[PDB]
Amino acid sequence: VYADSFVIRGNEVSQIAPGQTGNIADYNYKLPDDFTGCVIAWNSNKLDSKVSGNYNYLYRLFRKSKLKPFERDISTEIYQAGNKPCNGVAGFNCYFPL
């Protein structure tokens, strides 16, 4: 038995399912098409939020290739876009992935 626990936003809670595409389901966590098991979600706004806000949680937005199922992609690699070979500049056409 494997258990994976994490936190997301409501608008993407429907995105955690086999055979579905998007941003969380493609750049963060992809389930196999023949997955078996269960998913559980509950509300935690009232005891897991701050008046100023919490910036501990970050999600990936840009990736070179599609994520294969069950593959963590922890990597702070600067996105390469446009035609300028960034070497750690992290400026225009080179975005922060998270």
Add this chain to the structure above:
Amino acid sequence: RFASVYAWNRKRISNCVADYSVLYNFAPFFAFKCYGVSPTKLNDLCFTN
């Protein structure tokens, strides 16, 4: 400027070399659902019209 909803601006693409990578200059891509063909193999194909 784009047109309205009830009167869309249909255009026909004639013979030319099509690079399905320039459109990636647009970042968000709220939806990129491709039905007939797989997007990854979009580059290695030829179409009639």
